[PDB]
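request received
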Amino acid sequence: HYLAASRAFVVGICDLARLGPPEPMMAECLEKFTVSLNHKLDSHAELLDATQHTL
Amino acid sequence: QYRKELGAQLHQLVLNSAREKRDMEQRHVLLKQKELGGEEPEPSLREGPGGLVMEGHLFKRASNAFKTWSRRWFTIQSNQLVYQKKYKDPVTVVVDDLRLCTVKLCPDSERRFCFEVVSTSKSCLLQADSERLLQLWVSAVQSSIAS
Amino acid sequence: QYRKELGAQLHQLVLNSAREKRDMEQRHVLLKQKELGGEEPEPSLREGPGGLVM
Amino acid sequence: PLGSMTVKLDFEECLKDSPRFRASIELVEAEVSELETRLEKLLKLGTGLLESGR
Amino acid sequence: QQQIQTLVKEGLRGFREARRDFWRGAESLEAALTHNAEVPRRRAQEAEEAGAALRTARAGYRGRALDYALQINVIEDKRKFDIMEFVLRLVEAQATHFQQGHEELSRLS
Amino acid sequence: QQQIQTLVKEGLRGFREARRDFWRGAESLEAALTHNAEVPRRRAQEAEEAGAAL
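response:
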């Protein structure tokens, strides 16, 4: 529920980004910040998969 | 590391902007005080792909039963006069040809700044915003009648 | 006669005004850009009828 | 320049009042309302994330 | 609160008030044109008075148009930065959280 | 029509729009003071941010 809550919040920051102009700082930095956010959600998913295994 | 490096470019960038849009505001009060114009926008009679072009606002009379006056944007191009019915949508023809038109300077009319263009298939009364604009729309049709 | 004489003073008076309140506006954008203060109003500790007032 | 509202607003016809200019004033606004709903959707999701987090 | 709420709360106020007066001036311009066109040519003084108000309408509408231009021109630069700032502050708190938890990692190990 | 109607129609618009924003700014100032006063002294960065908005 937390990872899905986050995952929907990171899509809302993404939506700004395609609305805006597609300039180098927006185009590359703003995208590298938000993809690192999604990467971290998936890794954290692997920890809830491994907690479940454990339990 | 990325955050603190970008974030540092971000504070100066927006200081840069803060100066920028104030500079713009400072030119603007200078524009309003010193250079701001009360005169009507003036159309231009200048050569294009096929001869002289002019485009601009005019008043005309509607096709309703009261014949009520209304403002539309008119173009003279390729020995034709058309009127635009919406922005980005096909135009409608007002006079089929200009080489077959005559141009009425209407000195005994009640209506002010008006002219009439009368062609074989079609006529149109029209009315402009200034004595300059009358003479400039009457001369553009009059060069057009000589094409 | 009174109408045309006063009425003549009236057109210049309001031209005078038109300049006046624009001058005021021109100082004001200069005030806002250059001299406008973000700091709090500061009280003053100064002698009156019976000693110091604030 | 390359800005999203820049490239669909006509500075050039802004004193001149063409149907183009009236079209740009209208056209640019649609992004303004868009941007305001997306800002609002981000605030709602922000409390959802705060609620589930806690 | 610092960013997005401040942004929707403060940041479209001065542009929408410039939009309000600009379309009021449009309104003023259209009746200005209306009163300029419907006068008869015999009533010269009255028509000159009506055209003087049109010189008013047209000028001050150019004046209103510039303000709209200023204010749209501010929000194009402003929109990008504020939301970049918001994302800056997001991954900042993350970096700060993993580092506190990484810092005692040796004691845990 | 030229005078009195023009006068009530045009002539209080720009003052009432200046009145609207001035009292909005008053509103803004009062919450600005409100957020400046209620911060604790230990939370220095947050308080400095709130005083910058003031």
